[PDB]
Amino acid sequence: GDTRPRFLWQLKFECHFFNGTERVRLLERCIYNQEESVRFDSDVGEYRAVTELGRPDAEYWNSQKDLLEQRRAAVDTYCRHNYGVGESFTVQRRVEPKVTVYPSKTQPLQHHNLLVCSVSGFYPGSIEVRWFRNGQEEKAGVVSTGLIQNGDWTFQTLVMLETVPRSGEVYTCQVEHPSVTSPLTVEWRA
Amino acid sequence: MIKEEHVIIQAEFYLNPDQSGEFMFDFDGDEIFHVDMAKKETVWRLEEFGRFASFEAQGALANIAVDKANLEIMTKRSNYTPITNVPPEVTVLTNSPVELREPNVLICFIDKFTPPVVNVTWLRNGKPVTTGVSETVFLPREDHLFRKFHYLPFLPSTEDVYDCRVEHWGLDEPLLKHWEFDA
C-alpha cells in the first residue's frame, strides 16, 4: 500500500499555572517529526534553539522585537485569559465516582480469590482507595491498576484484594475523592 | 503531577504528504475542543464546555496555513529527513463494570505512536460494526507522540466477542485487541 515518506510539523503552546494563577510559565515549542527544534520559554524571555535545525529561526525570530514583546505579554493576554475562561468547567470540575465490589472469579471458600473494587466515572484524578477485612486495613495483597483515563474527562480504577475468604468475614472498600464530603463505603460479605 | 500545577496546551500539527492538519486544546491530558477542518467548526469535547466558552474556527485555519508553510520549509532544511514510524500500543477496556444486558462502552486506547495516522476498525464476532461509534482526534504527548480513543457502545452478552483492529505504518501486521465477557 502506502509507503511514501512522511513529514510532521507540530506547534505546541503550553501554559503552566501554579497556585491558581500566581505563577504562569508560557512555553512555545516547534517539533519537526519527533524532535524539538526551537522553543520560547517565558522564564528566558527569548527564543532558543534546541537543535541545529532550529538555530536560524531562533535568530530570525529573536530579531522581531514586536513579536518578543507580544510573546512576553502572552502570559497575561493569553494564558491567564484562557485559565479564567475555562476555570468553571476545568479546574473546578467535580464528578463523583461509582464504587462497586465484586469477586473477580467465582470459586469456593477457603481458596485464594481476587476481590475487585471498581471506582469509575470520577474527575479529577486524585483518589484514595482502601481495603479492610473485618475493620482492619489490608495493606498486603492490594493490587491496583492505577489511574485509567477514559478520554471523556472521567477516570476509573480497579483496586483488588488478594484474600482467602472465610464465612462471616466482611471485606470493605472505602474511597475518598474531592467530590464527596464523606467516604464512600461498599461491603462484601463472604 | 504537582498538585498546585495545571497545564493548558494548544497543539497543532500538519502532516505531509497526507496534507492532514489538526488544531486542538488540551487540559491536563483531556481534550477541551478541536477545530474540524471539514465543516469548519469548533467541536467541544463535552457539551457544557460550549455553554461557557467559544472559539472562532476560521482563525485556527490561519494557523494551519502557517504550519503547512513552515513544514514545507523545514522539510527542505532537513535535507528531506522523514519521520520514524513508532508503532502504537493498543488496549481494550470497558467504560464501567460489565453487567449483562445493560448498555456499556468498549474503549480502544491507542498510545505512543507517530506519525498521527491510524486506521481503526471495530469487529463484533469477526464482522465490522460501525453504528454508534465515536473517536477523539489525535491527542498530544510530551514526547511528541500521540494518543487516540475509539469508542463502541454495546450491549454486553455472553454470546459476542469484540476486536479493535489497528493499522499503522509502524506495525508489520494489523493488530487485533480482543474483548470477551469472562464469566
Binding site: 506547534l11 503552546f13 512555545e28 516547534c30 536560524p56 529561526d57 535568530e59 530570525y60 525570530w61 522581531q64 513579536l67 502572552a74 493576554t77 493569553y78 485569559h81 484562557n82 479564567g84 475562561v85 475555562g86 | 494548544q10 497543532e12 486544546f25 460550549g50 455553554r51 461557557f52 466558552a53 467559544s54 472559539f55 472562532e56 482563525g59 485556527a60 490561519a62 494557523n63 502557517v66 504550519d67 508553510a69 513552515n70 520549509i73 523545514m74
Partner: peptide
C-alpha cells in the same frame, strides 16, 4: 459566552 484566545505561529526563516 466568553471567547477563548489562541496564539498564532510565526513564519519560519526561509533563508
Amino acid at each position: 459566552t466568553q471567547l477563548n484566545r489562541a496564539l498564532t505561529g510565526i513564519a519560519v526563516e526561509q533563508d
